[PDB]
Amino acid sequence: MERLLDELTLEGVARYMQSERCRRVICLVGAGISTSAGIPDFRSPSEKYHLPYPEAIFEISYFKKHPEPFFALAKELYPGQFKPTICHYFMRLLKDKGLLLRCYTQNIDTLERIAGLEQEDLVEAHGTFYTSHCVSASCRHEYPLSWMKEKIFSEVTPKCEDCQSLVKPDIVFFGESLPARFFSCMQSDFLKVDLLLVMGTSLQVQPFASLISKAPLSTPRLLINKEKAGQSDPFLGGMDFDSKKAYRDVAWLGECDQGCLALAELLGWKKELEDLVRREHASIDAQS
Ligand SMILES: CC(=O)N[C@@H](CCCCNC(=O)C[C@@H](C)Sc1ccc(Cl)c(Cl)c1)C(=O)N[C@H](C(N)=O)[C@@H](C)O
Numbered sequence: 001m002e003r004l005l006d007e008l009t010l011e012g013v014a015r016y017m018q019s020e021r022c023r024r025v026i027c028l029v030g031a032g033i034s035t036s037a038g039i040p041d042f043r044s045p046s047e048k049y050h051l052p053y054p055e056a057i058f059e060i061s062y063f064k065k066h067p068e069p070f071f072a073l074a075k076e077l078y079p080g081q082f083k084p085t086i087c088h089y090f091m092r093l094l095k096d097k098g099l100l101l102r103c104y105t106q107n108i109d110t111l112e113r114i115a116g117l118e119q120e121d122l123v124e125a126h127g128t129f130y131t132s133h134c135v136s137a138s139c140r141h142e143y144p145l146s147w148m149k150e151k152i153f154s155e156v157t158p159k160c161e162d163c164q165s166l167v168k169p170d171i172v173f174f175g176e177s178l179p180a181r182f183f184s185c186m187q188s189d190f191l192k193v194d195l196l197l198v199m200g201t202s203l204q205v206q207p208f209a210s211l212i213s214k215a216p217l218s219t220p221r222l223l224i225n226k227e228k229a230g231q232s233d234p235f236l237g238g239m240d241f242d243s244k245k246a247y248r249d250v251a252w253l254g255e256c257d258q259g260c261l262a263l264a265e266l267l268g269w270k271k272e273l274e275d276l277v278r279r280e281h282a283s284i285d286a287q288s
């Protein structure tokens, strides 16, 4: 066939990546790339906040009237350390190797930035804790994560120093639209992509999940995930890993860290990746 992968395996993807045909990689990532960092999947299975209903703690209208439950939940689930995973540093290596067009992330945990992806490299489709803003439209003072953490830990509701309005993390609450950046980057990036690397997402949250259908028909798509995902739903109506018509989609099933290690090893990057992770982890462990 005219297909770009010589075989539908991780080995086939690595050979394609190091061929002249593969210049621009888009990563699509979800909570599975951060579970080994101790960040919980807010959407996965596994009280004192006295909400009118459970979903209120993540809705924008409620947050603006009663922000204390959200910031109480924030301190409770606040991670004791922000250490990106092997997967995050694999994407930094892609950037270093000149291969990363964009990382679209479902995650709000900031680990992509800590691992060295820059604003231009990222589409934080669901927002982020990395910056926060005064909610007053005429003010919009920006506050960094260090300022917000101090307010959350001292259990003081964060208020703007300029105008005393509430300060909200730049997360997309329910009732808010996705950032315009998501749609503007999608319209351009998918004209240019040679490889989709889908890591740690089961492609269940829309419109993010629809990004896989924006790839050109020839673009190979590798899923690294604990479970197979992204296939067409036999009910509702996609990834085709297993039919006789399959030609470009590959599933590597396991922990995201181990899949990225396996791919890096095939690429000849295992020592580079180990050295990067050990150095960055050491630096984070040594923060004083
Ligand atoms: C306008 C629109 O499209 N919004 C989408 C959802 C977009 C944001 C989803 N953010 C996440 O996943 C991030 C996770 C960490 S959870 C989270 C959520 C809020 C907060 Cl505040 C916090 Cl801290 C954590 C939407 O509602 N999609 C629906 C769906 N079920 O796919 C349906 C309409 O298609």
Ligand SMILES: [Zn+2]
Pocket (backbone or CB within 6 Å): 134, 135, 136, 139, 140, 141, 160, 161, 162, 163, 164, 165
């Ligand atoms: Zn303000």
